[PDB]
Amino acid sequence: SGFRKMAFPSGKVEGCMVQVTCGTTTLNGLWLDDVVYCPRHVICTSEDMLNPNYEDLLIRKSNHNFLVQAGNVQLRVIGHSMQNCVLKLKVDTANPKTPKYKFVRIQPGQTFSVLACYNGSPSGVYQCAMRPNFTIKGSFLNGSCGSVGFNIDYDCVSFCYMHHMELPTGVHAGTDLEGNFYGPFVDRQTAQAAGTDTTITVNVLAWLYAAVINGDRWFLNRFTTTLNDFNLVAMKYNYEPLTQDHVDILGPLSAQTGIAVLDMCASLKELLQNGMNGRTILGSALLEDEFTPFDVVRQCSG
Amino acid sequence: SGFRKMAFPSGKVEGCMVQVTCGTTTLNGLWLDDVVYCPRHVICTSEDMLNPNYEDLLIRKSNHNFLVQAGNVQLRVIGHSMQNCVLKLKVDTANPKTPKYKFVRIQPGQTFSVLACYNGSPSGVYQCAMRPNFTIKGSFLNGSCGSVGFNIDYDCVSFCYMHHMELPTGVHAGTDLEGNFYGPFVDRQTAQAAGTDTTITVNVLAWLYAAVINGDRWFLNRFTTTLNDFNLVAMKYNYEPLTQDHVDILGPLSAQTGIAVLDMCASLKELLQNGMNGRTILGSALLEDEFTPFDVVRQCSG
Numbered sequence: 001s002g003f004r005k006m007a008f009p010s011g012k013v014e015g016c017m018v019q020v021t022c023g024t025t026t027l028n029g030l031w032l033d034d035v036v037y038c039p040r041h042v043i044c045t046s047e048d049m050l051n052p053n054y055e056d057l058l059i060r061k062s063n064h065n066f067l068v069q070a071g072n073v074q075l076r077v078i079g080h081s082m083q084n085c086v087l088k089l090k091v092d093t094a095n096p097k098t099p100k101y102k103f104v105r106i107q108p109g110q111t112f113s114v115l116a117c118y119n120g121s122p123s124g125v126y127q128c129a130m131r132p133n134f135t136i137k138g139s140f141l142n143g144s145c146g147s148v149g150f151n152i153d154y155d156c157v158s159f160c161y162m163h164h165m166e167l168p169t170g171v172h173a174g175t176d177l178e179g180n181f182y183g184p185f186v187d188r189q190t191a192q193a194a195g196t197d198t199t200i201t202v203n204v205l206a207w208l209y210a211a212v213i214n215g216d217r218w219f220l221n222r223f224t225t226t227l228n229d230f231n232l233v234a235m236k237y238n239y240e241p242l243t244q245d246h247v248d249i250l251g252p253l254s255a256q257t258g259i260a261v262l263d264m265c266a267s268l269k270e271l272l273q274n275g276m277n278g279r280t281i282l283g284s285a286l287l288e289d290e291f292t293p294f295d296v297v298r299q300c301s302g
Numbered sequence: 303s304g305f306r307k308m309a310f311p312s313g314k315v316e317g318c319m320v321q322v323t324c325g326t327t328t329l330n331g332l333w334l335d336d337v338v339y340c341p342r343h344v345i346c347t348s349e350d351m352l353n354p355n356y357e358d359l360l361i362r363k364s365n366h367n368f369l370v371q372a373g374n375v376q377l378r379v380i381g382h383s384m385q386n387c388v389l390k391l392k393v394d395t396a397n398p399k400t401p402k403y404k405f406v407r408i409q410p411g412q413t414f415s416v417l418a419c420y421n422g423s424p425s426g427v428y429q430c431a432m433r434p435n436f437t438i439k440g441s442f443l444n445g446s447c448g449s450v451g452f453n454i455d456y457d458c459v460s461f462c463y464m465h466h467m468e469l470p471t472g473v474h475a476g477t478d479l480e481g482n483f484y485g486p487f488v489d490r491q492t493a494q495a496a497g498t499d500t501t502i503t504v505n506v507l508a509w510l511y512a513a514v515i516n517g518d519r520w521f522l523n524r525f526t527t528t529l530n531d532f533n534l535v536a537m538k539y540n541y542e543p544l545t546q547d548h549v550d551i552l553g554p555l556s557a558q559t560g561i562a563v564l565d566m567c568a569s570l571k572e573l574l575q576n577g578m579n580g581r582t583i584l585g586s587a588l589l590e591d592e593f594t595p596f597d598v599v600r601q602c603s604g
């Protein structure tokens with residue numbers, strides 16, 4: 001029993017964190033086989049960030065301008081290239097701790113673990129979701145750039161996020177491991193801001209099923225809803241539209257609990273309309289949306 | 303910016319998890335140097351649990367009754383002994399991945415990371431606190447016994463919890479790594495239950511300071527309180543008494559924010575008396591008590 005915001009064990013990713021220095025800028029990199037991946041703004045001064053031309057800035061660098069440190073060992077850079085907003089430093093040593101791994105670009109609403117790191121040294125691990133507005137509500141300080149987000153499946157690490165910057169509302173933006181930003185963001189100082197966000201409906205419904213699995217039913221009711229009428233209420237509360245695909249994905253949890261998906265939707269509609277009236281669900285007084293249907297199945301009893 | 307329920311990176315503990323089997327009972331063990339630590343009820347059948355005499359049960363076992371598996375390698379047991387409620391199996395191989403480590407018995411209100419494991423295989427990592435009633439609100443299924451809780455300090459792992467059982471309210475009980483239960487619990491099937499719990503006041507106050515550090519001040523007020531009058535209100539709301547030691551411990555956060563501890567107490571008193579009125583703090587609609595003052599300092603900007 002019990003339900004916690006669980007991250008994946010971080011050891012396979014710990015063995016890949018290094019530190020990268022260019023000039024006076026130091027950040028983290030990800031060392032897989034003989035390549036080190038890090039944010040390309042490692043080559044930037046602070047004045048460069050106003051309007052940088054990274055091709056121009058990078059053509060002025062050589063291999064020896066990059067200092068890569070893995071624990072107490074310096075790693076020699078023997079090539080460098082840029083791919084979108086990530087720099088790839090080829091080093092002369094393949095990481096002996098490289099896990100089986102993939103690079104994946106995730107969809108909004110998907111969750112992943114973040115291994116927060118400073119100076120190539122992991123400091124903590126936590127779970128978060130890619131918001132519908134393509135930010136994440138992380139916990140990141142100065143020096144955390146190059147920290148990565150990942151999922152683990154049967155010993156294969158799927159890396160999905162590398163950290164680049166903090167937006168003015170305190171939420172975070174970054175790229176996939178091929179350097180493409182999530183959302184409209186760019187790596188130059190501009191007036192860019194997080195767009196309006198929405199709640200991830202299919203995740204809220206998964207977490208209500210987690211609550212039932214863990215023995216809590218107080219929020220259920222005898223009603224059902226059509227998908228259309230549910231979405232009318234969802235739109236009103238800044239929830240994402242629920243699709244038939246979402247309903248299909250919630251199939252397995254529905255079957256385990258005996259609660260039809262559209263019946264759980266009628267429950268959520270009632271919770272949105274009346275609030276919780278001083279009650280909690282799984283120890284929360286807010287409707288939680290950072291658990292996917294897959295997360296619930298993985299963590300909960302069958 | 304940002305504030306997350308952060309666990310320690312789990313890699314150093316991942317390298318220590320093994321599986322232990324006795325008869326038809328399999329659970330997890332902790333392999334450090336040439337010793338494997340696991341719950342002593344690994345030697346029990348289900349009928350043994352009604353009134354077990356573990357000395358009697360253990361005297362009937364030999365080394366070869368214990369099967370220890372580390373990854374794909376069987377580990378040969380060459381001695382066994384019991385220390386309180388933990389069994390110590392001496393194996394013929396020292397774990398080459400043993401971290402620098404300590405065993406610590408923690409106080410209620412302290413937090414730690416849990417590495418949930420099944421069949422010697424880590425499945426997830428999360429943060430929790432030892433409640434005042436000496437339970438933890440974990441996330442544990444069948445097979446999770448022997449999973450451990452830990453803190454990490456400068457590469458030294460301080461193990462503080464090994465998981466033994468789930469109580470009827472769905473909260474969890476276990477021991478330190480020397481086999482002594484937290485709380486009044488025992489490893490035999492009885493009508494034991496979690497006692498009444500309280501909220502960890504010094505932790506709530508730490509988290510209010512985290513909120514201020516992260517730029518949220520809406521709950522502050524111009525008032526102060528005496529420690530005595532605060533504790534009168536705390537007692538009324540099932541909060542733990544706040545001590546002068548707690549106030550001293552909150553010193554550094556007080557100094558960083560410029561908010562005297564007793565002024566933050568007046569803020570908490572106002573929050574307890576009026577509620578939040580639909581507002582949130584650090585993304586929570588409840589007052590959070592699973593962050594110690596040390597956790598806040600570690601995670602937050604200075």
Ligand SMILES: *[C@@](O)(C(=O)NCc1ccccc1)[C@H](C[C@@H]1CCCNC1=O)NC(=O)[C@H](Cc1ccc(F)cc1)NC(=O)c1cc2ccccc2o1
Pocket residue numbers: 025026027041042044045046049140141142143144145146164165166167168172186187188189190303
């Ligand atoms: C990274 O660790 C990092 O890259 N530091 C090195 C660096 C900084 C500036 C120029 C070159 C190299 C930073 C992590 C941030 C730090 C703040 C707290 N939380 C974090 O996640 N990332 C940064 O410092 C970026 C650099 C950047 C600037 C512009 C851009 F388009 C892309 C990247 N800056 C910010 O994240 C940030 C937040 C903020 C608030 C107010 C004013 C400026 C500002 O920058």
Ligand SMILES: *[C@@](O)(C(=O)NCc1ccccc1)[C@H](C[C@@H]1CCCNC1=O)NC(=O)[C@H](Cc1ccc(F)cc1)NC(=O)c1cc2ccccc2o1
Pocket residue numbers: 001327328329343344346347348351442443444445446447448466467468469470474488489490491492
């Ligand atoms: C462990 O993984 C474990 O040790 N399994 C092996 C085992 C079970 C029974 C007898 C001998 C060996 C279990 C983890 C629990 C499992 C349930 C879900 N969440 C968990 O954390 N621990 C157990 O199964 C204990 C065994 C035990 C029994 C009595 C005792 F005093 C101490 C330990 N049992 C329970 O945790 C538990 C919960 C529960 C509810 C209702 C009826 C019985 C019952 O037992």
